[PDB]
Symmetry: C3
């Protein structure tokens, strides 16, 4: 351990996974996908009670890196699409499957896939200078991260559409109101308050946390995986299109 694009630390029964490309506003590139997956696969097995994701610097994440498309393979755009789809599908699935309580500490602006995944977390704490933006249809794409299913359930289809289809950008307050964020904190004391709270959580009976989440999450996974898959076919097609 061992990471180029992340900083993975483990203290107090809390594994903290920190995006670490602050220069590029924590954009998620092909390597970071793989690293995130390995970090979660690792934290799912270790003996931490609780797993956090957060961003280094001013951004939570700007979502997918624009350079994941431009690197072109031997089978042309046909194969790059199919390869990205496979990777994405697998990537989302790790979140669907993660067995321990998973928490997002949103430290600043979030975009794209980093936002859509938030529907799979167990809690989401945000600073009052975080924002949430999924401008999919602006860039000719469809939703992913299961968001086509989770976001209507969480926000109401009325509010979900303004965001997935019309690309409205939410403030932390709005996102909290619309169910996406668990709580907002003023920026100055953001880091302190979350961590105090997380530390307490990590002191709760460990199998109880793991089993409780199991009961809430299990019955629902098969559906999510099927949504993931469907989302990915539609996304593969969207990438080979004139509008993208």
């Amino acid at each position: 351990m061992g990471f180029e694009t992340l900083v993975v630390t483990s203290e107090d029964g809390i594994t903290k996974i920190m995006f670490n490309r602050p220069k590029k506003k924590n954009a998620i590139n092909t390597e970071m996908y793989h690293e995130i997956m390995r970090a979660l696969k690792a934290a799912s097995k270790d003996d931490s009670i609780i797993t956090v994701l957060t961003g280094n610097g001013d951004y939570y994440s700007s979502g997918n890196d624009l350079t994941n498309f431009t690197d072109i393979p031997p089978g042309g755009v046909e194969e790059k699409a199919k390869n990205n789809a496979v990777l994405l599908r697998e990537f989302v699935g790790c979140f669907i499957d993660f067995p321990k309580p998973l928490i997002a500490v949103v430290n600043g602006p979030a975009v794209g896939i980093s936002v859509t995944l938030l529907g799979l977390f167990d809690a989401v704490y945000a600073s009052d200078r975080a924002t949430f933006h999924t401008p999919f249809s602006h860039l000719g794409q469809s939703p992913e991260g299961c968001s086509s299913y989770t976001f209507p359930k969480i926000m109401s289809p009325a509010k979900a559409t303004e965001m997935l289809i019309f690309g409205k950008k939410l403030t932390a307050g709005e996102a909290c109101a619309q169910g996406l964020v668990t709580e907002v904190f003023p920026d100055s004391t953001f880091q302190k308050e979350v961590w105090t709270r997380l530390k307490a959580f990590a002191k709760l009976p460990p199998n109880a946390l793991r089993i409780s989440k199991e009961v809430i999450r299990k019955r629902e996974r098969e559906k999510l995986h099927a949504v993931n898959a469907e989302e990915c076919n539609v996304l593969q097609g969207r990438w080979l299109s004139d509008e993208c």
Copy 2:
């Protein structure tokens, strides 16, 4: 098919800026939906579904969004009596709701004033709902001895939480625009004086987005769910047929 605007008796249907605008137009009768308007609304959507607008809006003329079903749809009695009137109204309603379940473009309600009954329950099928601060929402079904429809027995609990949906479908609490926005039914409320302006500016923008992206995105959200909604619709209609032949309705 049609060129810029379509000939209807109870509606005004126009197409401008990749937006198809369907307006209820019986402002004298608070835009009450009568048998003819049902048919026209279906033909209007069928049209908007096939033309080359990006976005479809539903709105009311005058002060009301709609008062819901027209009371005069019951009194016009056929040769088979109330038995057949009920069966016919149940068939029409089922088919009518179905159009909304199946509509493939983004569908938006511009609620310019008080909405009632079917005009409210159908809101659970829309993609956005923008309301003026003097819009209200009211579904007093059980008060007139009836059961819910528009898929609202499924969508309203999902959207509002069963706790809040019941005060509305079962106990006929009327909501203000702000309440309805808070409870998930309305996307956004606007002050009346600037309501029309604001909504249309925003809509014009939306219409400028990549057309196939909007259509495909909606499809991904909406498709896996239709089969269930059609089932709910069907079930709501049988239960409603029954309710119309009962003592509590008269």
Copy 3:
């Protein structure tokens, strides 16, 4: 004829009142049985509307701690299996109740008495009511269908702070998060709720019952399956080191 409840019927409203105010209305083995018999009764009688409420200062403190300590001939193995069967059957009554069901939350609520709220048709609370499900704190898993209903009602984000991390909600929070229908100031709480309920009871009776039926029926089979699953996982949690 009830030991732990007070069941009355007036104005087409059946009122079921928890009545162990000395013990903060804790639900013991007997009260489970009585609540079931009371509902089974109210389901068949000619009331339009059924209310649950608490005597005294508490709505309910949830399960009584003395339901575990009374030990049977088959040891902890059988106690667990019996409690699981009872609980499953008990929750089922709420899943199945056919008339409109309303909780008048007069004060603090805990545990099973909170989780069941996801099954009610309305929930009116006094501004001094609170809602707390500290399951994982006592090494247990959720029940009352709450592992399914609470994410649907509150959003998984907010449901988790409650079922997994045991955050205690105030009535205002609970109302905001979708759990409670409306909050009333304590001084006029009783008055206001009953006025409203008396009105509701004057609505066309079959319309109420049929409307509820249309909202609720398609959804029961799932809830029963959730209830069952929740109970097996709970049985296991009782035979564990963390409990």
